[PDB]
Amino acid sequence: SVVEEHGQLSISNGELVNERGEQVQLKGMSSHGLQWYGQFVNYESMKWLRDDWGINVFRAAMYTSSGGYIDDPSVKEKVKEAVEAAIDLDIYVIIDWHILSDNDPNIYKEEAKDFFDEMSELYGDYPNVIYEIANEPNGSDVTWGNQIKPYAEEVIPIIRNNDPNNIIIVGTGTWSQDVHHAADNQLADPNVMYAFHFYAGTHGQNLRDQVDYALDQGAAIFVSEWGTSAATGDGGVFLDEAQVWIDFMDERNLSWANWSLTHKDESSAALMPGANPTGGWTEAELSPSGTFVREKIRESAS
Ligand SMILES: *[C@H]1O[C@H](CO)[C@@H](O[C@@H]2O[C@H](CO)[C@@H](O[C@@H]3O[C@H](CO)[C@@H](O)[C@H](O)[C@H]3O)[C@H](O)[C@H]2O)[C@H](O)[C@H]1F
Ligand SMILES: [Ca+2]
């Protein structure tokens, strides 16, 4: 029903809108690395998230490094499973080329182009797909002007050859925080959004102001990763500040995906160790983070 209702998404003056030009705000979950916690990504768990949490988007985090796609491309099978489940469930899905330790997107540019050509050839005709071409550029030697923009200018045409209109999310500097630099030197493609990532135990007002600067430049922003913990994904749970961030995003209608759907023993994890991989979770199987995020999505669902 989500995709049936909104259909083809597009950007209109920095806003994510549906095929009728109305605002759309996606709220969902991101998987953790598919090479480690892929069992939590399947039709049943996605259906449970759709039906019990109210998600309207699912993010498949395909790490490139750290035992991911570069070393073992079989993980692509999990990405396809996720996309196919999202199509069957009628929700949106983000295919995330999840760079991190490989901090410059240009490290695996050829492989990225090849992967996105394949993904866009396979799924380019479905409105469900959103491509996220470089999770988190990072490092002092990696900037928008020198590394990220040019990378995007090479990958985007590859996708556009097969899929002229689906949304493309592009990572920004300093672990997808530097949306101000991107907003001052935007890509030409009309259907792009810049990623902004935050952790409630580490980031606050200064970064909210930075996002506002970017929005004031007409840039579209997708919060494709955010956590209730510290920036490491652990170090405690900060729901007071997480709610400040939630309100901030609602005021601005920013779409988001929470990190992350896993049973790993880290504060940002949504599930407790041993949680059922196919869903149907008891309240006891959700962590404090998970309980809170589920409420945030339910309280705005339908
Ligand atoms: C956005 O931020 C989050 C939070 O920092 C990042 O997610 C964290 O990524 C860590 C690095 O991949 C990950 O730790 C790794 O976990 C693996 C699976 O258990 C371990 O094998 C590995 O030793 C360890 O470094 C955190 O668990 C995870 O929250 C996310 O990648 C960024 F995009
Ligand atoms: Ca099955």
Ligand SMILES: [Ca+2]
């Ligand atoms: Ca091709």
Ligand SMILES: [Ca+2]
């Ligand atoms: Ca398309």
Ligand SMILES: [Ca+2]
């Ligand atoms: Ca080039």
Ligand SMILES: [Ca+2]
């Ligand atoms: Ca709204």
